[PDB]
């Protein structure tokens, strides 16, 4: 069985780079704390005990309010009067650094104004190993360079607005199946531990880890570790991924929290790099914790060094001060668990004062504008046989497909979006927000047609083919809407347990499009979906005149789409994944059956880096629509490629901050009423063992503490660490590349030039994306696009050196409009 | 068994009043025609033989195009690029003569532009005897005065636009059950003849006939006779309703067409006063006709006098010239039967040249504006506890109910509107048109909220009550949409065979409303329906803060409603019928079982005039909302009632004329150069053998015994005491009393008042009050105006069966003026007038 080697001690923060000031302030405040106050920072107060999906008790004597952590990566979850933004996959489709940023900002502002201190997003894990993985749509793209950039921009947006962002899920949680034992049992499978992602060192550095190096370097304050194991060690106590990869090599200065139910030990996790336990209990409302009381005790009894808990508290405080959250603090002014104005202050046991729990704060501002725009700028025009844009003069418009219309239960009428009814604008699970409203395609397209005095109708029953066929024969244009949905594993829709059972359109989508196209010579297909779908049965139908994929556009869906169809917005989006002929063409199959008895199922990432386009190119398969493909209402020309060659070894000792006293200092204070199921830092009595309640307390302790886990002496700095996102020399710019880009068509719009390299050698992908931008050009206008290649951009990870190395194989650079349309290419000069 | 007494001969046209010129022109052309050409004018060509739901072959030698007759009373049926107007019952709710006229004008422009010569509407039959009758919504109100005025204004708008209007269904077709034999057999009922409406002579004159007198007087070109019998004689060969009441008494100068499949004899119908056979065959596509060839023969063999057939042709041509159809003539430029651009000229058999059958002519102009305005002005505010208008500042709006949402099959996705899915904007059967689009309440209300940056959702599944209650608890206002549908008898939705099985909200509507009201303290109910519904379980709920009835509003439904809810339009509409506590409170039960063995079911109208509010008042029952009830966003005051007495005809007809000549049987044999299209109905004979050309098993059997006395009498006739003018003796229209009252807007917002003038005619078997006059008046805050109207001799009379005339009885009469049939604060005794 795959094995995860140890890396100890857990590196301590050191004020690195842009962290120096936040770090000095965190040290100054943590220095004043008692041990039980530190422990309060590291541990949630129990599932649904307070307002937010995760919440710590804070440090009231020092005026630090409890930290409120709230889903989702696309808008506030479980709340009211908030916006519902387009999914991460749509931000990937925009290929637009500035939009990613502005979406981050607009979400940070909403969260901040609810009294939320930490946003649980954005996501870049799952990266997207498998096209049918249930949560890829929360993240960005199976491409690491595209994902890493947009992930970093999103983070900076949220954090510049004064909310800690949480880069999640770290790492390799690439499928929903078997991700949690209790979940897998509810679906009929008996496993003793969760799915183990088993991945080699080179692949993890070149693909899954790379967007997290970008997040760290961009200054992300939190990381959320994952439910899966990596080589049979749990994500939230994996010393290799946490202490070595994230903290020693990438130099992360912030804090690591567990996923909810992903904390599996007290001492083991603390020593392997975890900093925060969420939601704080061992199972939801168990009234027990692996930390809380247990972490106070582990420090009192000598097993967890004081320097390790000090370091947790300094990381947590430093991320809070880094975004300036102290200056924007207010208790959460809503409840995730009820919409009532009044309620008991502690929801789960219904205890504490009966008081106001929701203030109905409308934090939407004018955010509907960025959502509408982002929706339009993420709508990929995959095919257009001169059918779009529409003019508004079409005499009779047939809107066809349940995906055009309303969810009959209301836009929020499925808990956590857990259905596929009506237009698909948000997929399902925790990566969700309550819509303030939802503009459907039916609404916006019929309003547009009426403004021109046209005739128009929507048929929204996908088995009503007789009515579809009759109307399509009468119509000047048929706009056919289809979808494919997926979501987090705890919800099953039509037997899709989170992951998609297939890549085929839901609700009779293929047959609907064939019924329309059999009867109407101007059939235009609009897809809303979490990822790619199979189009092979109808994409090349002679009456199918255009095809668009619009992802998961959030609240302004119909308007984002009408802006594109009627030419208010010239589509610039490009596909952020591959559209293959068959599911087999993508390989990377999900693990769907037990393969290790009743132990943890083993998910070997045996393809290595060869996922999505890298896998199609390696198998010489031709996609229907390649990664990077999207059309425009204008045309662009790329020409004139020019290339130009451009001109600490040890840590400190681990510090301790403040002092630890006797057990008796940490016994529950006498005047305090203990709320049921609430997790506290205190001890029932000075008897450690009886106050822990742990059946293993004090047994074999030293043989269960890996070697070096309590070593607070100076440590070596790794060859590939010593910076933020890795050694600074990785970011030296070595080669400058330029091209001329001209709009040669008749409509202003955006080009997305893409620069790929070929690093060379028998095991390397033929091409890999490195740079891109999205550039606005009026008709006939030209611009020079210039970009640089870093040392990292030209390197491979060398497992023998434990470092990035520029290999001796000759390298090439390619520039064009997609991963398959690269008319400009050159040999790169040798650089090192 | 009820018996219908004979009345013969069938009165001939005479150029009465405003028909002088059209009759002279009709005479001049019919005088030039051959027998088979005259026959062509009277008989349709066969079910789906040509473009229109009914179509005659015309007179091509004289350049007279075939007459294209097309449904419906609310918009062109079976066509394309036309509008869908609100139903006639919304017109009633507006109480607005001007909107009734403008609706008729916009419909007539559309019909004319499609090359249609005759619109098959409007409808004042069914008047509305039973609140559950399947077609009352096509008409206006169970009140004759309200219906008659709006019927007449509708016909004038249509005719002034150059299209013949058809006042239908004449008469007493008050329910759908048992209306047609083969239809009843499809529902499992074996009957040998159609339901017989049996009604006394006073009742028919005071109620059902009265809007037909207004139609005739307003110059209606055509009348369509009905499927039912009246006292066991079929509507389309009832000499008493046709010869006596319509043609002799009301003085009708135009033509009577059959309902489709309501023609039941050749000789008997022609002599009893039918003028046109639709769709022209005996049963659809039977390639046999009671007229056509049979009528040509019936004249050749001496059974039907030439003067009768000539009078048919003259009535049909006079109606055509009276509206100026000859100046607008074009063949119909669409087909009712396919939407294809090209097809065979003769649809049913797929024969004749292969050519253009559809030109896709966009006839809508800007008619969406009148539709939108009329929907708003027909929205009755029944309850408002200071909940409406909405301001736009509501923070979270819950739109609740399937009736707010789209039909998942598309707005036209149920053939002839034969389902109740999504928002109910049009009821079912032939009284329908294809929507060009349909704006739902969901669309219009969500757009309004988003304009204000509010939050808003629609839940459109009526059994998703868990989602409904959760949202309602979070809402600032809950707008709950409910409906009740019905339609023509040939369609059954959920076991409702045209007529409604009950007056209860469909699709779980009472449970929806209670699930919302149990949870929002600001629940507003919007009803779309064909007629009244039972509101007793929730109307008085403390959390139901407003209730509106919006009828069947046609294509702008959701915008019409938003106009009212957000106060762009102050609702002025008034209930055109009563909202009772129970179904029993209305009495007048439908006949739903065979009550005459396998013979014609018998429908005795034994309540006499006491239908709708007249029945509630007779029984001293309190409606929830009475006839004439509607609220406003302002208040009005009535004062200063005053009454002022004012200072206020051949006795024989001419002999029946003949125009042109009839020749030998050999003049009328099939022309030799002509391909006879299958199923097509022709006026021609196979051979000079009359008997064998007719193919009638009863040809020449006991002929004289089956020709009623007087039936061939072409000599001068007495003018009836109640006849001699248009819609009856012109003395009935003398104005005898002027009434005036001052109406003031005493509130803070402009609005329309609908003053209502009722009379009490006195006497032990008379309704306590009956409506006579009304108008709709726009007043600014504080503004006053003097509303002045006049009572005519007719208005003050009762029908005296012994005199056969209208009489002002000697019981003392009273005038009452106010805002509804129960809110009448002003009263005045009337002085004796005669
Ligand atoms: C001061 O106060 C403190 C606070 O109160 C007191 O703290 C307690 O100290 C105890 C020891 O005194 C702790 O109890 C022991 O816990 C260990 C660790 O369990 C966790 O980690 C397991 C993985 O461990 C590896 O990795 C972690 C880091 O991730 C390392 O820290 C470990 O050292 C170990 O490292 C090796 O492997 C990695 C690669 O993976 C390498 O990189 C390293 O180089 C090393 O080679 C993990 O598997 C555990 O998972 C179990 O528990 C989860 C529930 O928490 C559950 O979800 C999992 O499914 C799994 O369940 C199964 O196991 C448990 C028992 O643990 C059963 O209850 C359950 O029913 C299932 O069977 C977990 O996350 C733990 O391994 C120890 O248990 C082993 O040893 C005891 C005997 O000593 C046996 O009785 C057990 O059966 C068990 O035996 C297995 O392991 C043996 C190898 O070790 C093997 O020989 C056996 O054959 C068998 O396979 C103890 O439970 C306690 O956690 C801690 N409490 C708190 C609150 O922190 C403290 O004692 C006090 N100090 C003083 C001085 O008084
Ligand atoms: C020149 O050319 C012409 C063109 O070809 C030739 O025209 C043909 O003339 C024939 C006579 O020679 C016609 O045949 C006869 O028709 C009659 C009328 O039938 C229709 O009207 C019925 C109601 O009648 C009353 O009202 C009408 C006006 O509405 C009057 O015109 C009648 O005079 C009669 O008036 C009385 O009552 C009213 C009140 O209702 C009073 O106000 C008046 O004061 C009078 O009192 C009606 O009921 C008929 O309906 C039947 O047929 C429909 C299909 O058309 C169907 O939908 C109905 O359900 C119903 O079906 C039942 O009856 C028919 C037969 O008629 C059966 O086939 C069927 O299976 C059902 O049983 C219709 O709408 C008709 O009454 C005559 O038939 C009676 O008498 C014959 C024998 O003489 C019997 O064999 C019949 O069974 C029937 O008997 C009933 O009535 C008797 C009283 O007379 C009674 O004694 C019996 O007990 C019995 O129950 C004839 O069929 C033929 O219609 C006509 N063709 C065309 C195309 O116009 C003409 O001949 C030729 N000239 C010459 C010289 O050659
Ligand atoms: C880890 O995080 C957790 C979670 O955040 C932290 O736990 C929280 O800690 C808070 C203390 O920081 C503790 O707060 C207490 O709340 C009690 C309930 O307050 C609510 O109800 C009251 C009463 O109806 C309302 O007034 C109030 O506004 C709230 O709605 C308060 O009652 C406590 O107030 C007392 O202590 C504070 C100072 O902390 C005084 O200012 C206040 O006047 C009260 O003082 C009296 O009681 C204290 C002892 O508790 C005495 O020392 C003092 O002399 C006063 O004594 C008189 O009155 C008491 C009875 O009132 C009487 O018996 C005596 O004889 C005298 O007459 C305080 O506000 C939260 O409850 C707690 N949360 C939970 C879920 O447990 C935890 O501290 C963190 N740990 C660390 C190490 O940082
Ligand atoms: C009663 O109404 C009936 C229905 O309107 C009348 O029947 C129609 O009478 C007309 C006028 O006489 C006939 O017209 C003829 O049609 C043929 C065929 O026309 C088409 O084909 C040719 C060649 O490809 C094409 O060139 C034409 O433009 C047409 O497209 C012509 O060839 C003749 O010259 C003549 O126009 C109709 O055919 C006929 N219709 C039917 C359904 O039978 C009937 O005349 C009326 N009777 C009375 C007494 O007035
Ligand atoms: C008249 O002639 C046609 C063609 O021969 C024949 O089909 C039809 O049956 C005849 N009509 C009658 C009443 O015989
Ligand atoms: Na086809
Ligand atoms: Na209640």
Q: What is the DSSP string of A285-331?
A: T-S--SSTHHHHHHHHTTSS-HHHHHHHHHHHHHHHHHTTGGGT---
Which residues of chain A neighbour B457 with C-beta distances below 8 Å? 410-413, 435, 437-438
B457 vs A395: CB contact, 8 Å cut-off?
A: no
Question: Closest chain A residue to B449 measured between Cα atoms?
Answer: A437
Q: How far is CA A712 from CA A19, A298, A581, in A?
A: 21, 17, 55
Classify residue A150 by burial, with Cβ atoms within 10 Å: 0-12, 13-18, 19+.
buried
Name the helix (H) or strand (E) containing B480.
strand B477-484
**Element spanning A346, H or E:** strand A342-346
Contact B798, B807 (CB under 8 A): yes
Q: Give the three-state DSSP class for A218.
A: coil
B664 Cα to the center of ligand 5, angstroms: 20
In sign, the C-alpha dihedral spanning A218, A219, A220, A226 is positive
Nearest to B456 among A437, A453, A460 (CB): A437
Which entry of A36, A143, A259, A310 is annotated as an active-site residue?
Answer: A259
Nearest to B408 among A438, A450, A461 (CB): A461
**Coil, helix or strand for B533?**
coil
The number of CA neighbours under 13 Å toward the Cβ of A523 is: 28
CA angle A305, A311, A315 (to 5 degrees): 160
The protein residue whose alpha carbon is closest to atom 23 in ligand 3 is A353
Residues of CATH 3.20.20.300 domain(s) within chain A? 1-327
**Contact assignment for A408 to B362 by CB distance below 8 Å:** no
The pair of three-digit structure tokens given for residue B449, joined into one six-digit string: 């909220």
Dist. CA B127–CA B138, nearest whole Å: 10
Residue B706 CA to ligand 2 centre (angstroms): 6
Residues of A in contact with B410 (CB under 8 A): 398, 457-459, 467, 471
Contact A257, A264 (CB under 8 A): no
CA closest to A452 among chain B residues:
B366
Give yes or no for residue A422 CB within 6 A of ligand 1: no
Q: CA dist A660 to A31, A226, A277, A666, Å?
A: 11, 32, 21, 10
Strands B496-497 vs B492-493: parallel, antiparallel or unpaired: antiparallel
- In angstroms, how far is CA B99 from the centroid of its own chain? 16
Distance B465 CA to ligand 7 centre (A): 14
Let me know: does B753 contact B741? Beta carbons within 8 Å. no
Query: Encoding tokens for residue A142?
Result: 């199976």
- State whether B80 and A437 contact (CB < 8 Å): no
Does ligand 3 come within 6 angstroms of the Cβ of A44? Answer: no
| H-type alpha helices, B435-474 | 441-451, 465-472
Relative to beta strand B523-529, strand B477-484 is parallel
Residues whose CB falls within 8 Å of the CB of residue A687, separated by 6 or more in sequence, listed in order: none
Chain B residue with Cα closest to A365: B453
Q: Pick from B287, B325, B323, B331: which is nearest to B60 by CA?
A: B331
Segment 403-432 of chain A within 8 Å of chain B by CB: 405-406, 408-413
Obtained via which technique?
X-ray
A178 bridge partner residues: none
Round to whole Å and give the CA distance between B437 and B415.
15
CB A438, CB A432: distance < 8 Å: no
Element (H, E) at B563: helix B557-565
Report the alpha-carbon distance of residue B142 to residue B136 in Å, rounded.
8
Any ligand 1 atom below 6 A from CB of A294: yes
Task: Kindly indicate whether the domain formed by B1-327 is annotated with CATH number 3.40.50.300.
Answer: no
Minimal CA–CA distance to A402: which of A480, A472, A500, A486? A480
For residue B683, the SS3 value is coil
Say if the Cβ atoms of B410 and A471 lie within 8 Å: yes
Integer Cα distance of B34 and A796 in angstroms: 102
For A44, A221, A677, the CA distances from A66, given in Å and listed in that order, are: 9, 17, 17
**CA B765 vs CA A768, B607, B615, B651, B762: distances in Å:** 97, 11, 12, 32, 8
Burial code (b: 16+ CB inside 10 Å, e: under 16) for A35-59 equals bbbbbbbbbbbbbbbbbbbbbbbbb
Classified as helix, coil or strand, A541 is: coil
- Residue A527 tokens, joined: 């897809």
Residue-wise over B246-261: b if at least 16 C-beta within 10 A, else e? bbbbbbbbbbbbbbbb
User: Beta strands A477-484 and A523-529: pairing type?
Assistant: parallel
Into which CATH architecture does domain B364-635 fall? Answer: 3-Layer(aba) Sandwich (3.40)
Contact A229, A262 (CB under 8 A): no
Per-residue 3-state assignment (H helix, E strand, C coil) for B332-356: CCCCCCCCCCEEEEECCCCEEEEEE
* Cβ pair A166, A117 in contact under 8 A: no
The CA distance from B130 to B123, in Å, is: 16
CA dihedral B138→B144→B148→B149, nearest 10 degrees, is -110
Judged by DSSP in three states, B782 sits in: coil
- Residue A488's nearest CA partner among A1, A7, A87 is A87
If one counts every other C-beta atom within 10 angstroms of the C-beta of residue A785, the result is: 18
Helix H or strand E segment including B315:
helix B306-322
Q: How long a stretch of residues is chain B?
A: 834
Residue A17 Cα distances to A14, A21, A728, angstroms: 9, 9, 11
- Angle, alpha carbons A268-A269-A275 (nearest 5°): 145
Task: Give the pair of three-digit tokens for residue A126.
Answer: 């799952």
Task: Judge if the beta carbon of residue B368 lies within 6 A of ligand 2.
Answer: no
Q: What is the C-alpha separation between A291 and A35, in angstroms, rounded? A: 13
The answer to whether residues A130 and A174 touch, using CB atoms and an 8 Å cutoff, is: yes
Residue B349 exposed, middle or buried by CB count within 10 Å (0-12, 13-18, 19+): middle
- Phi and psi of B758, rounded to 5°? -110, 155
Residue A798: φ, ψ to 5°? -110, 105
| Shortest CA distance from B397: residue in chain A | A437
Strands (E), A448-583: 455-459, 477-484, 492-493, 496-497, 523-529, 544-549
Determine the distance in angstroms separating the CA of B61 from the nearest CA of chain A, rounded to an integer: 37
The answer for residues whose C-beta is within 8 angstroms of residue A447's C-beta and 6 or more apart is A562, B443, B447
Q: Which of A409, A435, A458 sits opposite B459 (nearest CB)?
A: A409
Please tell me the residue having the least CA distance from ligand 1 atom 27: A268
Give the β-pairing of B826-830 and B813-818. Answer: antiparallel
Here the tokens at position A520 are: 């109407």
Burial profile B644-664: b = 16 or more Cβ within 10 angstroms, e = fewer: eeeeeeeeebeebbbbbebee
Decide: helix, strand or coil at residue A602.
strand
Residues 325-384 of A with CB under 8 A from B: 339, 360, 362, 364, 368
Looking at ligand 2, which atom is closest to the CA of residue B708? 33
3-state secondary structure of A68: strand
> Is the distance from CB of B370 to CB of B106 less than 8 angstroms?
yes
Kindly identify which residue of chain B lies nearest to residue A456, measuring between CA atoms.
B437
Token pair for A314: 């300094």
Chain pair A-B, CB pairs under 8 angstroms: 104
Q: Which residues pair with B740 in a beta bridge?
A: B642, B788
Q: Is B669 on the interface with A (CB under 8 A)?
A: no
Show residues of chain A in contact with B447, CB under 8 Å: 443, 447
CA pair distance B380, B184, nearest whole angstrom = 36
Nearest Cα neighbor of B326 from B29, B108, B55, B117 is B117
Burial zone of A724 (CB within 10 Å; 0-12 exposed, 13-18 middle, 19+ buried): buried
Q: How many CA atoms lie within 13 A of B386 on its CB side?
A: 0
DSSP code of residue A580: -
C-alpha pair distances (Å), B169 with each of A39, A91, A185, B153, B225: 87, 63, 70, 17, 5
Contact B410 A459 (CB under 8 A): yes
Question: Is A665 marked active-site?
Answer: no
Of residues B536, B291, B562, the one with CA closest to residue B423: B562
DSSP annotation string for B222-261: EEEE-SSEETTEEGGG-HIIIIIIIIIIS---SEEEEPTT
CA distance A445 to A437: 17
Rounded distance between C-alpha atoms, residue A774 and residue B361, angstroms: 46
Q: Breaks in chain B at C–N > 2.5 Å: after which residues?
A: 648
CA distance A446 to chain B (A): 8
Looking at the complex, report in whole angstroms how far the Cα of residue A78 sits from the nearest Cα belonging to chain B.
14
Length of chain A: 832
For ligand 3, say whether the CB of A273 is within 6 Å of any of its atoms.
no
């Amino acid at each position: 069985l795959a094995f995860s080697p140890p890396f100890y001690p857990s590196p301590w923060a050191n004020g690195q780079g842009e962290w120096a000031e936040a770090y000095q302030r965190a040290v100054a405040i943590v220095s004043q704390m008692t041990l039980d106050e530190k422990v309060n920072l590291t541990t949630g107060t129990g599932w649904e005990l307070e307002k937010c999906v995760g919440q710590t008790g804070g440090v009231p004597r020092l005026n630090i309010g409890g930290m409120c952590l709230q889903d989702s990566p696309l808008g506030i979850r479980d709340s009211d009067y908030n916006s519902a933004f387009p999914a991460g996959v749509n931000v990937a489709a925009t290929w637009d650094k500035n939009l990613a940023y502005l979406r981050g900002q607009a979400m940070g502002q909403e969260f901040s104004d609810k009294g939320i201190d930490v946003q649980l997003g954005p996501a870049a894990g799952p990266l997207g190993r498998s096209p049918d993985g249930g949560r890829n749509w929360e993240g960005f793209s199976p491409d690491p360079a595209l994902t890493g950039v947009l992930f970093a921009e999103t983070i900076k947006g949220i954090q510049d607005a004064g909310v800690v962002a949480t880069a999640k899920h770290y790492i390799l949680n690439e499928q929903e199946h078997f991700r949690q034992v209790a979940e897998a049992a509810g679906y009929g499978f008996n496993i003793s531990d969760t799915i183990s992602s088993n991945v080699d060192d080179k692949t993890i550095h070149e693909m899954y880890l790379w967007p997290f190096a970008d997040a760290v370097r961009a200054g992300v304050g939190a990381i959320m570790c994952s439910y899966n194991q990596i080589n049979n060690s749990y994500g939230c106590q994996n010393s290799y991924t946490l202490n070595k990869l994230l903290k020693a090599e990438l130099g992360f200065q912030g804090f690591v929290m567990s996923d909810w139910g992903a904390h599996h030990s007290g001492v083991g996790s603390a020593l392997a790099g975890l900093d925060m336990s969420m939601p704080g209990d061992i199972t939801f409302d168990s009234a027990t914790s692996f930390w809380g009381t247990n972490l106070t005790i582990a420090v009192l009894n000598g097993t967890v060094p004081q320097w390790r808990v000090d370091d947790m508290a300094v990381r947590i405080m430093a991320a809070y001060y880094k975004v300036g959250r102290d200056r924007l603090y207010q208790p959460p002014n809503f409840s995730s668990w009820t919409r009532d104005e009044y309620g008991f202050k502690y929801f789960y046991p219904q205890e504490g004062p009966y008081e106001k729990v929701n203030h109905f704060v409308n934090v939407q501002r004018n955010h509907s504008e960025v959502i509408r725009k982002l929706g339009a700028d993420s709508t990929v025009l995959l095919k257009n046989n001169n059918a779009l844009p529409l003019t508004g003069k079409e005499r009779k418009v047939a809107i066809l497909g349940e995906d055009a219309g309303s969810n009959s239960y209301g836009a929020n009428g499925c808990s956590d979006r857990g259905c596929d009814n009506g237009t698909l604008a948000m997929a399902w699970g925790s990566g969700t927000a309550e819509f303030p409203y939802l503009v459907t395609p039916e609404q916006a397209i019929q309003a547009e047609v009426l403004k021109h005095k046209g005739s128009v109708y929507a048929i929204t029953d996908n088995w009503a083919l007789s009515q579809v066929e009759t109307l399509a024969k009468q119509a000047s244009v048929s706009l056919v809407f289809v979808n494919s949905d997926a979501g987090e594993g705890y919800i099953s829709v039509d037997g899709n347990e989170g992951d998609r059972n297939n890549l085929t359109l839901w609700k009779n989508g293929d047959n609907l499009i064939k019924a329309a196209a059999n009867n109407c010579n101007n059939t235009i297909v609009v897809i809303h979906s979490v990822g790619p779908v199979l189009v092979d049965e109808w994409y090349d139908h002679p009456n199918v005149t255009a095809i668009l994929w619009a992802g998961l556009p959030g609240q302004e869906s119909g308007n984002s789409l009408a802006d594109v169809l009627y030419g208010r917005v010239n589509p610039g989006a490009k596909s952020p994944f591959t559209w293959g002929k068959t599911r087999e063409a993508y390989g990377d199959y999900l693990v769907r059956e037990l393969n290790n008895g009743n132990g943890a199922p083993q998910d070997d990432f045996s393809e290595g880096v060869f996922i999505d386009y890298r896998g199609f190119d390696k198998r010489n398969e031709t996609p229907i629509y390649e990664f990077g493909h999207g059309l425009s209402y204008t045309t662009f020309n790329y020409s004139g490629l020019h290339i130009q060659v451009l001109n600490a070894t040890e840590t400190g000792a681990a510090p301790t901050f403040g002092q630890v006293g006797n057990a008796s200092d940490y016994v529950y204070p006498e005047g305090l009423t203990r709320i049921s199921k609430f997790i506290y830092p205190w001890l029932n009595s000075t008897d450690l063992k009886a106050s822990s309640g742990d059946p293993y307390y004090g047994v074999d302790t030293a043989e269960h503490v890996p070697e070096g886990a309590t070593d607070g002496s100076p440590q070596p700095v790794l060859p590939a660490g010593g910076g933020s996102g890795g050694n600074p020399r990785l970011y030296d710019e070595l080669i400058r590349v330029s091209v001329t880009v001209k709009n040669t068509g008749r409509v202003a719009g955006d080009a997305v030039p893409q620069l790929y390299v070929s690093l060379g050698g028998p095991n390397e992908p033929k091409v890999v994306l490195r740079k891109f931008d999205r550039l606005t050009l009026k008709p006939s206008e030209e611009t020079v696009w210039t970009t640089t290649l870093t040392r990292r951009d030209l390197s491979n990870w060398d497992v023998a050196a434990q470092d990035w190395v520029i290999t001796s194989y000759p390298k090439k650079v390619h520039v064009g409009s997609s991963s398959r349309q690269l008319p400009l290419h050159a040999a790169l000069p040798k650089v090192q």
